[PDB]
Amino acid sequence: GLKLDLTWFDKSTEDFKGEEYSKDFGDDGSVMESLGVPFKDNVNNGCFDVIAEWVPLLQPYFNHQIDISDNEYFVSFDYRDGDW
Amino acid sequence: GLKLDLTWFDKSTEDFKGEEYSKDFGDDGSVMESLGVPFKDNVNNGCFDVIAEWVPLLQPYFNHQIDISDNEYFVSFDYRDGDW
Ligand SMILES: [Zn+2]
């Protein structure tokens, strides 16, 4: 089902540094609703800049330690048939 | 260097169909310039919708036969240090 695709870039050199997917949330788009982004209309449809208020809400799903002072972050909401 | 990330979905069902990276162009941003998308000033941003005019400009770098009448395409301009 739904997975969050997080990518980060260095603010200085601005090169693509890393990427990490969240666990599969299945058909529940609550995580997106909690971010203020409608589910059905925004999946597989572009990237969103990660703002400060999003950091703590997203952190529990990633091993990468999100630091918006050093990196620029983008999140895209990908959806595919269960079990990736 | 620069690599173009092409992802496409079925235009009817809306299901993911495939994804393919182009070769590494190094610091040659000519392909982006031909699309009318400033090289340095547009890498590592969101993704763009591929319009018909872009098809012949991109086709030489992908094995997949680009067909917009059947699929919907997105392209991202990813830039990382060399040797990826
Ligand atoms: Zn994107």
From Swiss-Prot, chains A, B:
Keyword Oxidoreductase: no
Origin superkingdom: Bacteria
Record's keyword terms, sorted: Bacteriocin immunity, Plasmid
Entry keyword annotation includes Secreted: no
Disulfide bridge map: none
GO molecular function: toxic substance binding
Pfam families: Cloacin_immun
GO biological process: bacteriocin immunity
Induction summary: Probably induced by SOS-stress.
Function: The cognate immunity protein for colicin E3 (ColE3), protects cells which harbor the plasmid ColE3 against the toxic action of ColE3. This protein inhibits the 16S RNA hydrolyzing activity of ColE3 by binding with very high affinity to the C-terminal catalytic domain of ColE3.
Comment, domains: In complex with the cytotoxic fragment of colicin E3, Im3 residues 39-45 move outward to form a wide hydrophobic groove at the top, which interacts with an alpha-helix of colicin E3.
Family membership: Belongs to the cloacin immunity protein family.
Assembly with partners or alone: Native colicin E3 is a 1:1 complex of A chain and protein B (Im3). Binds between the translocation and cytotoxic RNase domains of intact ColE3, blocking access to the 16S rRNA substrate. Forms a very tight 1:1 complex with the cytotoxic fragment (residues 456-551) of ColE3 (ceaC).
Name the UniProt record assigns to this protein: Colicin E3 immunity protein
Provenance organism: Escherichia coli
Gene name tied to this protein: imm
